[PDB]
Design a protein around this ligand. Structure first.
Ligand SMILES: CCCSc1c(F)c(F)c(S(=O)(=O)NC)c(F)c1F
Ligand code: NA
Ligand code: NA
Ligand SMILES: [Zn+2]
Length: 258
């Protein structure tokens, strides 16, 4: 009876195994764009993905992860609200059963069809597993997806999904360029928060881009043909793998833009 996204083991249950679910800096949150504080001293975000090395794509039973070689400073995030250098380890998405829901963060209570999370760890701490135990261990770049025109830089990911349909499947995934998933503007909101799946550790500086990317209905339909179950177990479509907005508590969301 492990955690997942249903009536009996979904987000409202997670606090029984992970009590930090009711903690003081949990994610996601609703971003109130009118009450976000413009901070004219926030720097532009530096996304340096030219040398990125993807390796593999994996269905972990919760989402699919595109994994990168993070054994050298090859794909890094810095600047923005960050001190120090954070290495890209993987990205994944959260999405809905319908185009009207799927994102974890919301903007003035608006839900997007999906949300991309590019996960990075602070080189300070030497690897991802040590970094998640630190309050400034991770920087997650969050990008909303709306349904409209196709994102051509997403199609290599969508086309491989049929090979990792079920939990525990993986496939080689080299030479994928994550710059193809970025919108034109790097204007962002930022706040201190947490992982949005168990263990829900409060180790994340969240950086949420204001501009969504558009993907087609066909692209997101393909995400919804994945499965949460293993091969030869009964079919449960991988849809609605998002945690809803959590209380902001004693936090201020800062904006890089007016
Ligand atoms: C061993 C490498 C896995 S790194 C990972 C992940 F797989 C994940 F799902 C989330 S999330 O809580 O689901 N989105 C915030 C993360 F934050 C992560 F950092
Ligand atoms: Na190279
Ligand atoms: Na690692
Ligand atoms: Zn995520």
């Amino acid at each position: 009876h492990h955690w997942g996204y249903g009536k009996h083991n979904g987000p409202e249950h997670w606090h029984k195994d992970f009590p930090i679910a009711k903690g003081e800096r949990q994610s996601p949150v609703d971003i109130d764009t009118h009450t976000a504080k413009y901070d004219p001293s926030l720097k532009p975000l530096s996304v340096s993905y030219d040398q990125a090395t993807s390796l593999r794509i994996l269905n972990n039973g919760h989402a699919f992860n595109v994994e990168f070689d993070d054994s050298q400073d090859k794909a890094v995030l810095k600047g923005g609200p960050l001190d120090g250098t954070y290495r890209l380890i993987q990205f994944h998405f959260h999405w809905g059963s319908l185009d009207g829901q799927g994102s974890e963060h919301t903007v003035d209570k608006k839900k997007y069809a999906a949300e991309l999370h590019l996960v990075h760890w602070n080189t300070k701490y030497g690897d991802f597993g040590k970094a998640v135990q630190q309050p400034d261990g991770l920087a997650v770049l969050g990008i909303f997806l709306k349904v409209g025109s196709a994102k051509p830089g997403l199609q290599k990911v969508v086309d491989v999904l049929d090979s990792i349909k079920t939990k525990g499947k993986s496939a080689d995934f080299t030479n994928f360029d994550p710059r193809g998933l970025l919108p034109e503007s790097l204007d962002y909101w930022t706040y201190p928060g947490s992982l949005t799946t168990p263990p829900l550790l409060e180790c994340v500086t969240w950086i949420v881009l204001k501009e969504p990317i558009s993907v087609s209905s066909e692209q997101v339909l393909k995400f919804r043909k994945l499965n949460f179950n293993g091969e030869g177990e009964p079919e449960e479509l991988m849809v609605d793998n998002w945690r809803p907005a959590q209380p902001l508590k004693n936090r201020q969301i800062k904006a890089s833009f007016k």
